Amino acid sequence: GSAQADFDIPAGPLAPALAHFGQSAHILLSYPTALTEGRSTSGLAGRFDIDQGLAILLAGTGLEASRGANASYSLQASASTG
Q: What is the DSSP string of 11-78?
A: SEEHHHHHHHHHHHH--EEE--HHHHTT-EE----SEE-HHHHHHHHTTTSS-EEE--SSSEEEEE-S
Phi first, then psi: give them for residue 40, nearest 5 degrees. Answer: -125, 140
Residue 65 and residue 80: Cα distance in Å, rounded? 12
> 82 in a domain, yes or no?
no
- In the chain, how many domains are there? 1
d(CA 6, CA 63): 22
Q: φ and ψ at 50, to 5 degrees?
A: -45, -50
Residue 27, domain member (yes or no): yes
Q: How was this structure determined?
A: NMR
Query: How many CB atoms lie under 10 A from the CB of residue 63?
Result: 27
What is the DSSP pairing of strand 64-66 with strand 72-76? antiparallel
CA angle 22, 29, 68 (to 5 degrees): 110
The number of angstroms, rounded, from the C-alpha of 8 to the middle of its chain's C-alpha atoms is 12
Answer yes or no: is 61 within a domain: yes
